[PDB]
Design a protein around this ligand. Structure first.
Ligand SMILES: NC(=O)c1ccc[n+]([C@@H]2O[C@H](COP(=O)([O-])OP(=O)(O)OC[C@H]3O[C@@H](n4cnc5c(N)ncnc54)[C@H](O)[C@@H]3O)[C@@H](O)[C@H]2O)c1
Ligand SMILES: NC(=O)c1ccc[n+]([C@@H]2O[C@H](COP(=O)([O-])OP(=O)(O)OC[C@H]3O[C@H](n4cnc5c(N)ncnc54)[C@@H](O)[C@H]3O)[C@@H](O)[C@H]2O)c1
Ligand SMILES: [Zn+2]
Ligand SMILES: [Zn+2]
Ligand SMILES: [Zn+2]
Ligand SMILES: [Zn+2]
Ligand SMILES: [Zn+2]
Ligand SMILES: [Zn+2]
Ligand SMILES: [Zn+2]
Ligand SMILES: [Zn+2]
Lengths: 340, 340, 340, 340
C-alpha cells in the first residue's frame, strides 16, 4: 500500500507531501490509521534542526497522532484492531533500566521518539509500540484529544513536578499549545493561575480558560508585576519558546518556590544563582510524561476538565501551519485532520 | 561592662580590635560568653559589604560563635545559664509568616543574620535569641564544633535536598572548606561518594574521608568519566559554585538527578535549556538550614561521624586570618580561640 | 468583671450556665470577646470525663470559639485589639521541641488544648495565646467560620495526609460536622468524592456538597459496594464515631491506598493485618492541624470553596444541643451564637 | 529431560522428592539452572495451603532460587545464557495496570508468585520470566545471596517505607530470620538501631551487628523504656507480626512516627484508635519489593554491608529442614545447596 505523508528532507527546507510506502507492523508492533495529528512546536525545532541531537533525515514528524489500530503483529495483547490509540513522543523505552523500573520511562536512555528518531504521525498510517501508546477515552473525538498526547501530558506532568498544592499560585509562562491546556490542568488541580505571554490575544485566551491574573511581558517586567500582584507564585511552568522567559520566570516565585521547565528553545538562559541559593529556589526540567501520566492526563480530558482549543488543517497545508506557528499566529493548537 | 571585639567600621578596611560594652540581654534574650568563634568566607563578604544588601556599620562579624549561656533575660525556657550553645547565621525569624509556620524559617524575609545584620561572635560576649541558638553536644569541644554551625549544617541540608537515598551516588564537587565536611556527611548518610576537584591533595583527602571514587578535573572530564563509570550521579553537591563547576555538574548528574548549589557566587550563570529539560534535571539552591537541620547536623559531629579540619587563631590576629583566607591559603577552617 | 459561661463542674452531669469572672490577659496573652462558638463532638467527651486523659474540673469547653481581640497583654505583636481571631484545639505548643521545630506543633508533648486542659470558648470571653490563634478572614461571618477552627482544619489536614492527588478517588466516611466539610475540601483539592454514613439524609447532604457517589452502611456493605462502584478508593478519610466503619474503611481502598483517621470513638478496631501487608495499605491517624494547616483551611472558606452547614443555638441551650448531637440528629454543625 | 524436585502433592503432607520433566522455556521465557535455593516460613504456608488463596496442586515450592540462565526462549534481551539470576516471589506482573505503570508491580492484582502459583526453585531447573528475575551481583556466592531475594528485599523496602532518614531512630522488632538482616540494612542506611526481642541471644546478635540499644521485653516494657531513653523511635519495623509486637510498636513509636509491618499473620488485630489518632501514627503494610527495590537490596549485599546468617541442606533433606523450621529450631536462614 502507499500513503500520503509530510516528509522533512533538509533542515530549514519546506516539508514535501509525498506518496510513501505504508509501514507494516512487525512482531510486537501495531499499525495505526491516523484520524488527527497535532502540530507541536517541537516539530518545528525538529524540521529546523534547532537541537544538539538532530533527527535522522528524512523522517515524517508528528507525535500527537491519534486514530484506530488497523493491524496487529504477533505477540500483542495490550490492544487490538479497532482500538482508539495515540502515539506520543515517548515511542518506546527499554523497560528494565533503573529509570524504567522506577516508573520514570521518560528518562530511559534507550528510548525512541515518535516523529524524531522513528517516523511519526504526519501521515495516513504509523507503526507503533503498543506497550507505549496512549489508550484514548471513548467520550472524546480524535481532533480534540490529539493535543493531550503531547501538550496535555507534558504540562500535566510539569505541573505535578512544581510541587505546588491546592490553593497555591502557579504561573503559566507561554500560553500556546502547551500553555493553554496548562491553565486548565492547573485549575483542575486546585491551583490559582497567573498567565504570562508577549501577545494580548494569548493572554485573553488564558483569561477565558481560567487564569485569574495575566500580564504581557512586552508591556512590563512580569516578575516585578507578579511579586506586587500576588506576592510571588509558589510555582511556575515555563512553556515559552524564548530563553528570556526562562530568566524572567526565576524572579516570579516566592522564596522556596519551584520553576518547572518544558520549553525547548535552543541555547542558555541567564540564571541569578545568588538569589536561587539565598531564596532556596528550585529549577526543574520536565520531559513529557510516563504512560501513567499520559493516562491520567487523558482522564482529565474525558471528564471535561480540560478541552484543547483547536483549529484543523489539511496535511497539504503543513508548511503554512509551520509558518503561522513560527510567527506566533496560532491560537492554541493546530491539528491535522485525516477524517473523511 | 566592657569587652574586646573585632569591629568592622568601614567596608574593606582592616578590622579593629576595640574595647566595647558587653551586650546585656533583655526579655526573651540570652547572653553567650564566647569560647570559640569560627571564621569563613562569608565574614569577608560581611566585612567588604559586597553583597546586594549590606551590613549596617559599625558591626561585629561572626556567625559561628560557640560558648556558654552567661546570662538570661526574663521568659526564657529553652536554655539556661551554663548551657553550651552556638549562635549561627539565622539569628532570628519572625515566627508568623508562611515560611516560619511551615518550618522553613531559613526562608523568612524578616530574618536577622548573626555577624551581618546584628552583632555576632567576634567578641567575648554576644546577645542571642534563645529560640534560634544551636544546642551543642556535650562531648565535642568548642573549637571542633564551631564550623558545624556553618559548613556542617549547610552541606548536610544541601545533601538532604539532593533527594538521594542510601546506596545512591552523590558527587561532592569541591573538597575545600565545605566539601571536606560534605564527604563525611554523605558517607554517614549511606551515600556512595564521588569526589571531584582539581587538587590531588584534596582528592587524596576525600578518599581518606570515604570517597569511593575521586576524579581530577584538570586531567579527566569528570562528566564523561562518571557517565561511563557509574552511569552519572544521582545527586551533585556543588560546594564551590563557579560557572565551570555548575556546567560540569549538569554533565555529571544522571537523568532525573538533582544538583544542590551550596554557595553564593556573583553574576548570572548560563543554564543550558536542552540538557536540563531532556534530562529532567533538578537544580536547587541551598545554604545553611533550619533549627531542626542544625540540630540534626550537630548529632553527626557528636557521634564522631563528622569532624571538621580545624586550626586556631587569636582574636587579635583576625586580619592575618582574613588575609590568609583571601589568598586561598586556608586548609579546612580557622577558628578563633577565646579559651583562657 | 463577670460573664456567662457553660461550665463542666462535674463529669457526666449537665453543664451549668454560670456567671464567672472574666479572664484577664497577662504578658504574651490576649483576651478574645466571643461572637460565636462551634460545638464539636469532642466537647461531649470533655464533658463526660470520657477519654484516657481527662480535663481537670471545673472547666469551660469549646475550641471553636471565634471573636474579636478585646485586650492585649505585653510583648504581643502577631495580633492587635480589634483583630478577628479564633481559638482552636491547639491552644499552645512549646515552640522548640523536635515536633515544633519541624512544623508539626500538633504533636507537641507540651501542648495545651482549648476547652479541655485550659478554659475555652463556651463563654463570653476567653484568654488565648496569640501565637496559636487562627487569624480569620473578614468576609466570612462568625457563625459560618467557627467550624473551620476544628471541623475544617481537621479534615483539610486529614485529606492532605491520605496522600491522594487530583483526579483520584477519596471516600469520606461519616458526613457529620467534620464529614460534610471534608466533601467540600476534597472537591477543592481536585479529588473525586464518595460518601459513607448510616443515614440517607446525611448522604444527600454529601451529594449536594459534591460527592459523586454515596452508600448507606446500614443498607449494604460499603466496602464491597465501593470496590464494585469505583474500583476501590485511592484514599479514605474516616470521621465516623463508630469503631466499625473504621474496620470497614480498610476494605474500601485499592492496593497501595491510604486510610486517614480523624474519629475518636473509644476502644479498638479490628484490623485485617494480612490484607494490609499483602496489599501495601497505609493506615494513618491525623490530629487537627498546624497553624499553617489552619490558615490554609480558612483561606478555602474565604474564597467560598467551603461553607459549613450550620444551625445556631444559644449558650443556655448547650445541653439540648449535646443530646441531639449524641443521637445523630444534627445536620452538619451547631454553633452557639453570642449575637445580641 | 528429567530432574529431581521437591513436590507438594497434598497440603500438610511431607514433600516428595520426585523425578520430573525439566521445564523448557517458550517465547519470552528463560530457564534457570538452580545452584542454591532459600527456604523460609512462606514455604511452610505454601505447603500447608494455609493462606486465603491456595496454591494449585501439585506444585514445586521455592521463591529464593538462584543459579545460571541455562536456556533462553525467543525475544529475550534482558538476560543471556550464563547470567547469574534469582527467581523471587514476584514471578511476573501484568505490566499494564495502574500499579505496574506506576512502578509498583508488587501491587499487581494479576501477579504470579514463584513456588506458590507457579513452580519454583525446589528443583534442579525452573522456568522464569526474564523481565522479573533478580540480576545477581558478581561478588557474592549463590548460597549467601539467596535469602536476599526474600528476607533482604522485604526488610530493605520495609525500612524505606518507615519514611525515616539517616540519624533517626528505628526499632527492629524481632531479631530472627528477617530481623537480623534488617539490623544490617538499617545501619547501612544511617539509622540508629534499637533492637527489641525476648531472646537474650538474639539481642546479643543485634548488638554485634550494630544495634546501639537492645531491650528485652520479658524484663522491661520497651514502650516505656524507649520513650524515656530515646524519646520514642521515628520508625518501627515489625518483623514478627504478633498482636503483642504490634501493640508494643504503637507504644514505642514517637508521635508522627511510622510502623512498618513486615509479615503475614492470621486474624484481626485490635488497633487502639485514640493512640493512633492522637499520636498521628502511621501503620503501613510492606512485604517483598519491586524489581527496583530488589536490585537496590542486592547492592547492599554486594558491598559487604549485609550478610545473612546461612546454613545449607540438601534437597533430599527438605523435610528435615521443614521440621526444624516448624519447631522453631532454625537460626538465620537455611538454603538448599545444589552445587556439585
Ligand atoms: N519538555 C517537553 O516534554 C515538551 C514537550 C512538548 C513541547 N516542548 C516544547 O515546549 C515549547 C512550547 O511548545 P508549543 O507547542 O506550546 O509552542 P507554541 O508555539 O504553541 O507556544 C509558544 C508560546 O510561547 C510564547 N512566547 C514566546 N516568547 C515568550 C516570552 N518572552 N514570554 C512568554 N511567552 C512567550 C508564545 O507567544 C507562544 O504563546 C516548545 O519549545 C516545544 O518544543 C517540550
Ligand atoms: N483527629 C482530630 O483532630 C479530631 C478533630 C475534631 C473531631 N474529632 C473527632 O471526630 C469525630 C467526629 O466529630 P464530629 O463533630 O464531626 O461529630 P458528628 O456527630 O457531627 O459526626 C458523626 C458522623 O459519624 C456518624 N456515624 C456513626 N456511625 C457511623 C458509621 N458506622 N459509618 C459512618 N458514619 C457514622 C455519622 O452519622 C456522621 O454524622 C469525633 O469522634 C470527634 O471527637 C477528631
Ligand atoms: Zn510535543
Ligand atoms: Zn529504560
Ligand atoms: Zn561561616
Ligand atoms: Zn517569618
Ligand atoms: Zn474538635
Ligand atoms: Zn513542642
Ligand atoms: Zn522466602
Ligand atoms: Zn499489573
Amino acid at each position: 500500500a502507499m500513503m500520503k505523508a509530510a516528509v522533512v528532507r533538509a533542515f530549514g527546507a519546506p516539508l514535501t507531501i509525498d506518496e510513501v510506502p505504508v509501514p507494516q507492523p512487525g512482531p510486537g508492533q501495531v499499525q495505526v490509521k491516523i484520524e488527527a495529528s497535532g502540530v507541536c512546536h517541537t516539530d518545528l525545532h525538529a524540521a529546523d534542526g534547532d537541537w544538539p541531537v538532530k533527527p535522522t533525515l528524512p523522517f515524517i514528524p508528528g507525535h500527537e497522532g491519534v486514530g484506530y489500530v488497523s493491524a496487529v503483529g504477533s505477540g500483542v495483547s495490550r490492544v487490538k484492531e479497532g482500538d482508539r490509540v495515540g502515539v506520543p513522543w515517548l515511542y518506546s523505552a527499554c523497560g528494565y533500566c533503573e529509570h524504567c523500573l522506577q516508573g520514570w520511562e521518560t528518562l530511559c536512555e534507550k528510548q525512541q521518539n515518535t516523529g524524531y528518531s522513528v517516523n511519526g504521525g504526519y501521515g495516513e498510517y504509523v507503526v507503533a509500540d503498543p506497550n507505549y501508546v496512549g489508550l484514548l477515552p471513548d467520550k472524546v473525538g480524535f481532533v480534540e484529544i490529539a493535543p493531550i498526547l503531547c501538550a496535555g501530558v507534558t504540562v500535566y506532568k510539569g505541573l505535578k513536578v512544581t510541587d505546588t498544592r491546592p490553593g497555591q499560585w502557579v504561573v503559566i509562562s507561554g500560553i500556546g499549545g502547551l500553555g493553554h491546556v496548562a491553565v486548565q490542568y492547573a485549575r483542575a488541580m486546585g491551583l490559582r493561575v497567573a498567565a504570562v505571554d508577549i501577545d494580548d490575544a494569548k493572554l485573553n485566551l488564558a483569561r477565558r480558560l481560567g487564569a485569574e491574573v495575566a500580564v504581557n511581558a512586552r508591556d512590563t517586567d512580569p516578575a516585578a508585576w507578579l511579586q506586587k500582584e500576588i506576592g510571588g507564585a509558589h510555582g511556575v511552568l515555563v512553556t515559552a519558546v524564548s530563553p528570556k522567559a526562562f530568566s524572567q520566570a526565576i524572579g516570579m516565585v516566592r522564596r522556596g518556590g519551584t520553576i518547572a521547565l518544558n520549553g525547548l528553545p535552543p541555547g542558555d538562559f541567564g540564571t541569578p544563582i545568588f538569589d536561587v541559593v539565598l531564596k532556596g529556589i528550585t529549577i526543574r526540567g520536565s520531559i513529557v510524561g510516563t504512560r501513567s501520566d499520559l493516562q491520567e492526563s487523558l482522564d482529565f480530558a474525558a471528564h471535561g476538565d480540560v478541552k484543547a482549543t483547536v483549529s484543523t488543517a489539511k496535511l497539504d497545508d503543513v508548511n503554512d501551519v509551520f509558518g503561522r506557528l513560527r510567527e506566533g499566529k496560532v491560537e492554541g493548537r493546530v491539528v491535522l485532520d485525516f477524517s473523511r
